[PDB]
């Protein structure tokens, strides 16, 4: 799916990503055991990478606005929750929040006039 996105097929890849992460969450819910818990850590890593890609691709497609910011924020928060010790996830989450701050500042300036 990363290759699909790199092939310019964006919307379909993103929808597939949503479906795949939902399925992967369902599988996690189905996953309860010790060695299965290790596979669940692997699941968390993979699906946190996935959530980061969901946030990034939704940002790229739908741009930045009041409606889009909550969804990507939710994706990145989920990614951080899945892996708290991944630099990319936390950096992306902070970058998104900072961009939201800048966006609201810009609309403050617009509202001033």
Swiss-Prot record:
Ranges for the TPR repeats: 1-31, 32-86
Intracellular or extracellular location(s): Lysosome membrane; Endoplasmic reticulum membrane; Golgi apparatus membrane; Cell membrane
Binding site for 1D-myo-inositol hexakisphosphate: 2, 49
Variant or mutagenesis effect after changing residue 99 to K: In SKS; results in increased mTOR signaling
Expression tissues: Expressed in numerous tissues, with highest levels in testis.
PTM text: Autophosphorylates when part of mTORC1 or mTORC2. Phosphorylation in the kinase domain modulates the interactions of MTOR with RPTOR and AKT1S1/PRAS40 and leads to increased intrinsic mTORC1 kinase activity.
Family as reported in the entry's similarity comment: Belongs to the PI3/PI4-kinase family.
Subunit relationships: Part of the mechanistic target of rapamycin complex 1 (mTORC1) which contains MTOR, MLST8 and RPTOR. The mTORC1 complex is a 1 Md obligate dimer of two stoichiometric heterotetramers with overall dimensions of 290 A x 210 A x 135 A. It has a rhomboid shape and a central cavity, the dimeric interfaces are formed by interlocking interactions between the two MTOR and the two RPTOR subunits.
Function field: Serine/threonine protein kinase which is a central regulator of cellular metabolism, growth and survival in response to hormones, growth factors, nutrients, energy and stress signals. MTOR directly or indirectly regulates the phosphorylation of at least 800 proteins. Functions as part of 2 structurally and functionally distinct signaling complexes mTORC1 and mTORC2 (mTOR complex 1 and 2).
Free-text note on domains in this protein's UniProt record: The kinase domain (PI3K/PI4K) is intrinsically active but has a highly restricted catalytic center. The FAT domain forms three discontinuous subdomains of alpha-helical TPR repeats plus a single subdomain of HEAT repeats. The four domains pack sequentially to form a C-shaped a-solenoid that clamps onto the kinase domain.
Disease: Smith-Kingsmore syndrome: An autosomal dominant syndrome characterized by intellectual disability, macrocephaly, seizures, umbilical hernia, and facial dysmorphic features. Focal cortical dysplasia 2: A form of focal cortical dysplasia, a malformation of cortical development that results in medically refractory epilepsy in the pediatric population and in adults. FCORD2 is a severe form, with onset usually in childhood, characterized by disrupted cortical lamination and specific cytological abnormalities. It is classified in 2 subtypes: type IIA characterized by dysmorphic neurons and lack of balloon cells; type IIB with dysmorphic neurons and balloon cells.
Protein name per Swiss-Prot or TrEMBL: Serine/threonine-protein kinase mTOR
Organism field: Homo sapiens
Location of this fragment in the whole protein: 1701 to 1813 of 2549
